[PDB]
Write a protein that binds this ligand. Structure first.
Ligand SMILES: C[C@@H]1O[C@@H](SCc2ccc(OCc3cn(CCOCCOCCOCCO)nn3)cc2)[C@@H](O)[C@H](O)[C@@H]1O
Ligand SMILES: C[C@@H]1O[C@@H](SCc2ccc(OCc3cn(CCOCCOCCOCCO)nn3)cc2)[C@@H](O)[C@H](O)[C@@H]1O
Ligand SMILES: C[C@@H]1O[C@@H](SCc2ccc(OCc3cn(CCOCCOCCOCCO)nn3)cc2)[C@@H](O)[C@H](O)[C@@H]1O
Ligand code: NA
Length: 315
């Protein structure tokens, strides 16, 4: 009922994913603590011992962001509970990124979210993690080196963190949205727009979620003061739930998506738009396929919601 390859995947591994349209990369932790990359270039590949991009503390969070597949950054925790980065650039390959040298100390139970800021060719990064005082701290890279950005206040110790960046087509700079769990177990959004900065208000997206539930988010289809967003978390029913932001409706359409193992982590990628025979969504999680394999859920225009690849490489 398992496979040799499935047995190599850590149960409740952190999961992250990046893409350029339907060209996909998925990152996960093996049972030895190595971070591996599985890939989709027309078919699923890799995820083996030969596809290791670095090592992290066992049980580390795993976050990733990209500029198409030209630049990829993967964030995890060291054994010393400092932030670290595995970097890929086209023409260079993989290397140990400069974030680790800053030795930013976070809570041992911190999660991580990461985004490249949208709508610029410049490489601008925002990383979100939880300090020992349980506050959410932004870390920035704007070409001058890593610096602390805005502190976004208290959250539940060990909260999941989701993040997305998009640029409205009528705006002169990028927007950011992040989601986390507060000390009262609610799920909330914080928001950055270039005229308002960080909005003061925490917007509740779900009234009560399991403590330290996984949180993952995406955005797509930016237009003139318009955006679409999807947030995923693991609910008390041992399923992933989806919360939708749709332009002109706001937050609505909250409901279950797919069952998962107790304590599954979650990753989401998206591409395209309602306007051009999209969008496409791909969700990654553990649902007990081959016990410990990572599985995929798909949304597309052709067939809507359905389970995708049942067991990613190496399973
Ligand atoms: C991006 C990197 O991809 C490969 S190296 C070879 C490769 C590189 C880039 C590729 O691009 C796919 C692609 C096509 N279009 C359009 N956008 N992205 C396809 C294959 C991986 O081996 C590597 O680890 C990293 O994920
Ligand atoms: C964006 C940054 O990438 C490198 S520094 C080297 C680099 C800088 C700029 C690049 O722009 C293209 C490509 C690579 C990392 O070391 C650093 O921590 C950060 O992720
Ligand atoms: C997008 C936002 O970026 C900054 S404030 C604006 C800013 C953007 C880029 C910057 O680069 C260095 C000059 C400096 C400042 C952060 O302080 C803020 O929290 C948010 O992430
Ligand atoms: Na973990």
């Amino acid at each position: 009922m398992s496979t040799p390859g499935a047995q190599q995947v850590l149960f409740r591994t952190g999961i992250a994913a990046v893409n350029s349209t339907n060209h996909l990369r998925v990152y996960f932790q093996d049972v030895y603590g190595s971070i591996r990359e599985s890939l989709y270039e027309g078919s699923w590949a890799n995820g083996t011992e030969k596809n290791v991009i670095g090592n992290a503390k066992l049980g580390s969070p795993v976050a990733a962001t990209s500029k198409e597949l030209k630049h990829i950054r993967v964030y995890t925790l060291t054994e010393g509970n400092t932030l670290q980065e595995f970097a890929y650039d086209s023409g260079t390959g993989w290397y140990n990124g400069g974030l680790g040298g800053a030795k930013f100390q976070v809570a041992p139970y911190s999660c991580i979210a990461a985004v490249f800021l949208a709508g610029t060719d410049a490489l601008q990064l925002r990383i979100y993690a939880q300090k020992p005082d349980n506050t959410i701290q932004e870390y920035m890279w704007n070409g001058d080196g890593w610096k602390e950005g805005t502190n976004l206040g208290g959250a539940l110790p060990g909260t999941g963190i989701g993040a997305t960046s998009f640029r409205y087509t009528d705006y002169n700079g990028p927007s950011i949205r992040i989601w986390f769990q507060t000390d009262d177990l609610k799920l909330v959004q914080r928001a950055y727009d270039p005229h308002k900065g960080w909005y003061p208000d925490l917007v509740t997206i779900f009234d009560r979620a399991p403590p330290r539930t996984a949180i993952a988010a995406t955005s797509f289809g930016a237009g003139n003061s318009s955006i679409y967003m999807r947030i995923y978390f693991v609910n008390s029913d041992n399923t992933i739930w989806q919360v939708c932001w749709d332009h002109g409706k706001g937050y609505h359409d909250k409901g279950t998506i797919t069952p998962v193992i107790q304590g599954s982590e979650v990753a989401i990628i998206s591409w395209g738009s309602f306007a051009n025979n999209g969008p496409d969504l791909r969700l990654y999680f553990q649902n007990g396929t081959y016990i410990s394999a990572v599985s995929e859920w798909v949304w597309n225009r052709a067939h809507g919601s359905q389970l995708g690849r049942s067991a990613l490489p190496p399973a």
